[PDB]
Amino acid sequence: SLKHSVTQYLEEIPQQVQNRLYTSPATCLAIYRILPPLAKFFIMAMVFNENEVPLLDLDKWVNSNGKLQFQNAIKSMKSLHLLIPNKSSGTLMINLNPTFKISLRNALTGGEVQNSFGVVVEENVVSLDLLDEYSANKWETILHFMVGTPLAKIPSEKVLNLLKHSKLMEEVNSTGEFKITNEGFQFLLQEINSQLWTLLLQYLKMIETMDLVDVLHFIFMLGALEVGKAYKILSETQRIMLQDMRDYGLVFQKHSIFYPTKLALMLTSDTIPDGSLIVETNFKIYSYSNSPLQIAVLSLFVHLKARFVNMVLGQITRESIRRALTNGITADQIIAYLETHAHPQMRRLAEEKLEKKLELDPNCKEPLQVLPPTVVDQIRLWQLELDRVITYEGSLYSDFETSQEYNLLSKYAQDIGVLLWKDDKKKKFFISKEGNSQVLDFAKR
Amino acid sequence: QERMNILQNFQYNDQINTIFLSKVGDTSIDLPEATCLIQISSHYGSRRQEAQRLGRILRAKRRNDEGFNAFFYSLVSKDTQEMYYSTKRQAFLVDQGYAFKVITHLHGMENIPNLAYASPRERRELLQEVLLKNHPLIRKMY
Ligand SMILES: [Mg+2]
Structure with missing residues (x-):
């Protein structure tokens, strides 16, 4: 959902603001890449020709097999307003946005670019020694803070404010601590690419009044920049943002020239x-990993016992699972992490198990389960234990003068979806606290 | 004598396909025809008795035919001390390598024609029945 999330944000932008977003070719080159392959084909056709083409001509290009894709491509292209539908002379003519059209032409033809790509000072630096370490450590520092593992340096208030204000890393002053949430665990699961977009996407929504267009002109322009190169100094809002981006391990500054980073x-x-790790029937864990990231994430729902240079060994326990579950981590997410991070040896034996299962009876294709089924069941069973006791908040209604009134009020609650329990014999029912006011108002009327 | 006749009949007589063993048959009795195994009660937390009982079906006749898989069912009452004893008396087999499959639901159990104690009347009757459980010449005279 990488492009979908970015594309979804671009749709909510007003068309008047979208036009301004297309002025800079740098952004256009990226917005051109995000579209589906078929959509990109048509855009490249219309960009260089100064004419109007009916939509029927576009349909002729696509084969009958790809008709479905032609619907998603046109819908996605029309949603962004990049494709302007003009109807005249009884025909629905199709044209591209003039600003987007002009912006794309300038970049491809090497025309004036208004420094959308920046400038070069020729002051290259060593990237592996400093840039890789700095951003990796800076991106790791926020993760250690997210994971909760102790670390001396803490992230700046700018990002910290964003985290709390965002659904990520729910915090409470009364508790005085920070803990990961369901989406927080998903965030840690997402690849580095999406793992960076999520924080940035939250940053886009957080910012208020720094112009919305300026923020996009900078983020998209950042991808255009090449690591290990110097760039002179940029918008006024971008200056504070550039410092803000320095806190996310995206751009490195010596203290006039800013250097992008590998993450850019x-x-x-x-x-x-x-x-990669191995899971035994004894609920033991043996991870063939040498990295704080793998160790830090495993400790969320694993009770580590010992470690070696090349591998880390631990044992799953009810306490560790309960601690993870108390934080909102679903068992489905846990198994997904284990399944998608399984050792090749487990996959090979699991493939053999599937082959053996199919060899004996090839009629059925059982799911390929890398880890023994008992672990999944027990983990799910532990989840059921937490969900054993179920409690709601609300009010109980009783002492109804007539059954008709009891049925009327109870039926009304069911219609609005606030009824939790009823009994015709006792003429009593229970409704959620949320629907209490609505039910009372209906009772009076 | 009686048990030997029972064992031979079960071994060779097709009519007797199932039996009801006890602690006496917990170990050192060979039943090459046994393939399925069930246990109702248990002697608290002993992990050894668990392994010995399983051994009755581990020596089944057809242990080499394709796709042969013996069955071991362990019925246990939920929310009782049995879970304490079940997980405590089965910690040795897990070490060996055996893995128990949790059966929360048995498919097709409701469609069986008749089931014991299906009505509340029988349950109440059983409840009370189980609850109530707790001069040499003078020798002729005599
Ligand atoms: Mg012996």
């Missing part, structure tokens, strides 16, 4: 294993 290019497109 990773934002545009994508790009034994570390983190």
